[PDB]
RNA sequence: AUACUGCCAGCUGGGACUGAGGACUGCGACGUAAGUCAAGGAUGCUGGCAUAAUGGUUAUAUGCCGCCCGUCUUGAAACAC
RNA sequence: AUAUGUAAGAAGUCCUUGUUACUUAAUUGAACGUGGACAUUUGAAUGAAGAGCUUUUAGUGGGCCAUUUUUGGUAAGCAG
RNA sequence: CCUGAAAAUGGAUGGCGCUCAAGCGUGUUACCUAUACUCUACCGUCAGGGUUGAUAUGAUGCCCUGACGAGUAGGCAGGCG
């Protein structure tokens, strides 16, 4: 017998191998972890593992995040590197002319891209011209804005969305809700 | 890229060289071992001429064994014997004596046989069951470059180099002795010496603090 | 194991008030030295303000027997705790060493007031060889001069299981 | 593939230990060492031998 | 019928399992529950910091 | 029924002490506690404003608020498999700066001072602090010290 | 100059179980120079038998061990269902 | 005695304020800061088997027995 | 050791039997054997890694290394029909 401080057989808790059966993604992993035990570059270890994300963990990204992205200093001829879905942004005016690289463009996005004059790439081809990862920048979406993480925690004194149907008047913001019927939370 | 004799020939000669300082450490060590215990008897030797009595020095090293299963154990001797990374029985430890380990001991003695390893079982030890923890994992050392590419950084090139840094408890102690995996021994060739293990040794039992005949019982455990 | 008289010397631990301690020794009886360091501690604890922890011992050592050949009248004086309460004995045993004696004496004590090694404090190991200074019957009978008795009924242990003859028990 | 145990398999020893063959050949196991004659006090053998 | 009453038997050994973690430690603090004398105090200070950096490092 | 007051199993603790009863002695209100200052808690019984609850006699805290009589003491507490969070608003005759805290900032400056000190000539200070060590060897002379030999006593009534 | 203790990288024997694993590498040892070796896991030689002989299956005998399953239950082989 | 809180530092330490509407008699402080001085010892030991974190959901919510402490009871294979 | 010492079917130091014991107290050894320990093989699980090499070898392929394996209620996974 072996007195056991850890548990037995504990798998890693991560993902290796994406739960997705697109051959396309599949064939992007397979360069991918090439590149991340070949070449010692951070970058392709962080985009192997990207590669594996679920879709909620992969949230869009907007061409307006990426504009901004592009206004950090030095980085305005940088590589813009989204694993996911590129999105087109109706509230900015004006774009640069810089090269993004994703798994997926809305139209929009593609056509707002090509029109200001940059490249609309996958990321293999982001991979023959940058294999270790040179001037890029990876652009990740915002994943704590969707609508089912606002009702994650809900409890008393915690500001966390009810799950609910029907928003108004007597539905829930009764007692419980208010001082004035018995207590507020 | 021909590549016979140019980088064989390199790479033996840097071998050999590493042979060389091995073997002038071991010849040191050797030196450094004899010469400590002829002072230790001179000493003696000397009090008694003088009318006095040589105390000798508390001992720095002990090796602990637990002696008992991991069922039924309370607490808090439970996490010292973890801590001390004897999770089996018959597993053993080196443990650099301090007032902090000391204390550590004295929680888990129902549980353990220690006492004062010599050189020569420290030696025996390391050299019949010695892996070292390399990557999370238990390799067995069986050549030099494995402690020299794990342990190196301080100093210590050798199995010997390793050994001298128990046996004369070194500033890189914490390291070369965590650096040994657990070692695991077997039941005691000849027996435990008494009808039942779970009384102190004093009582005629096994467990708790054995000072020199801890040499036996892991010489004959090993 | 056998026992084996130790000298056990020592002292409280030097503080800066009282260096030098008083360096108390005892002759004690024990199967080896961590046994003897332990009944050391054991007694002087109960003799004086010091355990283990305060004071350190400066000298462990073997004391022999002067001359293992020869037989002498050994005078031993013990104290014992019983099933009720607590009794002084002085015993006396022939032997040729003060610890195969004491070996005779604890397997006496075990046998006759079933006293366990736990509960026998030896106090006085005490050699004469001068009859007179004999008390005990059972030792002075060996005393006479000129003596000589048989060894009536002499039983011959058998090696194998069967035996073509009945056994004689002359001498 | 095989662990070997030094104390045995001389060679494992040796590729281990150089010194093993200094250590052997002269005879450090069982080494002489010289002789004075320095008497303990006579102090010393009367506490011991003290009744 | 009777039933046992109550015991704290094997809720020690429960809260071990994943258990006794002391809360996560941050940088700055909630200024909640502190004076509003000082809160108030804290948020111009913290202000003029903000536009003096500002103009040092313009 | 059951008792469970808030101050119910407090008659020792919150007891005065013995030839200390009284008015509170003024140093206690001379004291200063600043946000981060680490403070130990024991309640005053005599002063029942501001008075922690049972469970926090004897636990040691951080300021992280000061008001007129008072601070706030962040406490860990444990509930359940996790320490949770308390907030105490306690009067300042109920809690006194921890003195462990106090030696240590002591050291801080004495590790500070004697890195100093070495660095002035590299001499490897080691400020790190050492559990005791097994003794070194020592010779114990005899002269004026002869051992004295001891036997166990014969039993005896001494009643 | 010795029934004790310690050490020997001292020596000489007698038994047992195991032989995992590459189309080509490592670390070492041994002679002063064809290279060998017990050095990152068994080979060499010699028999008998190409068949139910070994072995698989099944029946019995023998040695030792083996309460009736499901369920409810703190607890079942239960004289609980 | 045992059990128990806290601390043993990089979110730490050493400058005439840099800010404020707080505070002070007052650049006095308080809180938070810019620049300066500190990787093999980063300020005890031992260990660390990867940290930390989130979501969601099953079963369970009759317990019982050692040692030790212990209540009611003469006691109990009793009750707590 | 004996008296004190009385319960109901026949009867239980487990049984036989044991009397310088095979009883009792103690000491010293030798010896026996667990699914435990040591070592080795094989299965699985988990972990950590290697591998874009020739006119043979889908890269969830091939391979290296280490550790681990009890399980009701229950969860999940890979499969069988």
């Known amino acids: ?102 798994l997926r463009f809305t139209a929009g996005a593609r056509a707002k891209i090509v029109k200001a004059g940059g490249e609309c790439i996958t990321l293999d081809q982001l991979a023959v011209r940058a294999p270790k990862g040179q001037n890029t920048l990876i652009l990740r979406g915002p994943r704590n804005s969707r609508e089912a993480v606002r009702h994650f925690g809900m409890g008393p004194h915690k500001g966390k969305a009810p799950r609910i149907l029907s928003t108004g008047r007597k539905f829930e913001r009764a007692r419980g809700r208010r001082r004035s019927k018995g207590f507020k939370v | 890229a021909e590549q016979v004799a140019a980088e064989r020939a390199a790479r033996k000669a840097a071998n050999k060289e590493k042979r060389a300082i091995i073997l002038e450490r071991n010849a040191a060590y050797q030196k450094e071992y004899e010469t400590a215990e002829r002072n230790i008897i001179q000493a003696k030797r000397d009090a008694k001429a003088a009318g006095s009595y040589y105390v000798e020095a508390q001992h720095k090293l002990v090796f602990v064994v637990r002696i008992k299963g991991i069922n039924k154990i309370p607490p808090k001797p439970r996490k010292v014997l973890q801590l001390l990374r004897l999770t089996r029985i018959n597993s053993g430890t080196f443990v650099k004596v301090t007032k902090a380990t000391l204390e550590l001991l004295k929680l888990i003695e129902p549980y353990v046989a220690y006492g004062y390893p010599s050189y020569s079982t420290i030696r025996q030890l390391v050299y019949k069951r010695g892996f070292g923890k390399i990557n999370k994992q238990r390799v067995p050392l069986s050549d030099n470059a494995i402690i020299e590419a794990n342990l190196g950084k301080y100093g210590i090139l050798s199995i010997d180099d390793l050994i001298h840094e128990i046996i004369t408890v070194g500033p890189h102690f914490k390291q070369a002795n965590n650096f040994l995996w657990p070692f695991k021994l077997s039941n005691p060739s000849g027996g435990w010496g008494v009808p039942r293990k779970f009384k102190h040794f004093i009582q005629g039992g096994s467990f708790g603090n054995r000072e020199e005949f801890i040499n036996k019982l892991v010489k004959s455990m090993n | 194991a056998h026992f084996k008289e130790y000298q056990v010397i020592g002292r409280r631990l030097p503080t800066e008030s009282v260096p030098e301690p008083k360096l108390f020794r005892m002759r004690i009886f024990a199967s080896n030295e961590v046994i003897a360091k332990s009944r050391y501690w054991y007694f002087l604890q109960k003799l004086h303000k010091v355990k283990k922890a305060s004071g350190e011992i400066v000298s462990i050592n073997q004391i022999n027997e002067a001359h293992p050949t020869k037989v002498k009248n050994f005078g031993v004086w013990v104290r014992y705790d019983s099933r009720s309460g607590t009794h002084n004995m002085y015993k006396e045993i022939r032997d040729v060493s003060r610890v195969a004696a004491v070996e005779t004496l604890y397997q006496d004590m075990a046998a006759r007031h079933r006293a366990r090694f736990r509960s026998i404090h030896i106090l006085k190991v005490a050699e004469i060889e001068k009859t007179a200074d004999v008390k005990r019957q059972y030792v002075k009978q060996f005393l006479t001069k000129d003596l000589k008795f048989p060894l009536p009924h002499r039983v011959q242990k058998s090696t194998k299981t069967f035996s073509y003859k009945r056994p004689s028990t002359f001498y | 593939v095989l662990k070997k145990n030094p104390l045995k398999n001389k060679q494992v020893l040796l590729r281990l230990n150089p010194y093993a063959k200094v250590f052997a050949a002269e005879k450090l196991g069982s080494k002489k060492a010289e002789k004075t004659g320095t008497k303990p006090a006579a102090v010393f053998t009367e506490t011991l031998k003290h009744d | 019928a009777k039933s046992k009453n109550h015991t704290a038997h094997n809720q020690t050994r429960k809260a071990h399992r994943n258990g006794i973690k002391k809360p996560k430690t941050y940088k700055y603090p909630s200024l909640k529950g502190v004076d509003p004398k000082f809160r108030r105090n804290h948020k111009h200070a913290l202000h003029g910091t903000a536009k003096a950096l500002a103009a040092a490092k313009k | 029924g059951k008792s469970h007051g808030y101050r119910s199993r407090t008659r020792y603790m919150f007891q005065r002490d013995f030839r200390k009863h009284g008015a509170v002695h003024l140093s206690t209100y001379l004291k200063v506690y600043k946000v981060g200052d680490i403070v130990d808690i024991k309640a005053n019984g005599s002063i029942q404003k501001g008075m922690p609850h049972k469970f926090y006699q004897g636990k040691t805290g951080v300021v992280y608020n000061v008001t007129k009589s008072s601070v706030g003491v962040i406490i860990n507490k444990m509930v359940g498999n996790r320490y949770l969070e308390k907030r105490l608003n306690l009067r300042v005759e109920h809690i006194k700066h921890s003195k462990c805290r106090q030696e240590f900032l002591e050291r801080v400056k004495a590790n500070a001072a004697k890195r100093a000190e070495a660095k002035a000539q590299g001499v490897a200070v080691q400020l790190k602090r050492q559990p005791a060590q097994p003794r070194e060897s020592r010779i114990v002379s005899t002269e004026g010290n002869v051992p004295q030999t001891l036997a166990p006593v014969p039993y005896e009534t001494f009643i």
């Open chain 1, 1 to 102: 017998g072996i007195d056991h401080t850890s548990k037995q057989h504990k798998r890693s808790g991560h993902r290796t191998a994406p739960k997705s059966d697109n051959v396309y993604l599949k064939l992007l992993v397979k360069l991918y972890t090439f590149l991340a035990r070949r070449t010692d570059a951070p970058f392709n270890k962080v985009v192997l593992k990207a590669l594996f994300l679920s879709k909620i963990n992969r949230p869009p990204v907007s061409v307006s995040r990426i504009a901004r992205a592009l206004k950090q200093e030095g980085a305005a001829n940088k590589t813009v590197v989204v694993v996911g879905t590129v999105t087109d942004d109706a509230r900015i005016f004006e774009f640069p002319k810089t090269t993004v690289a994703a």
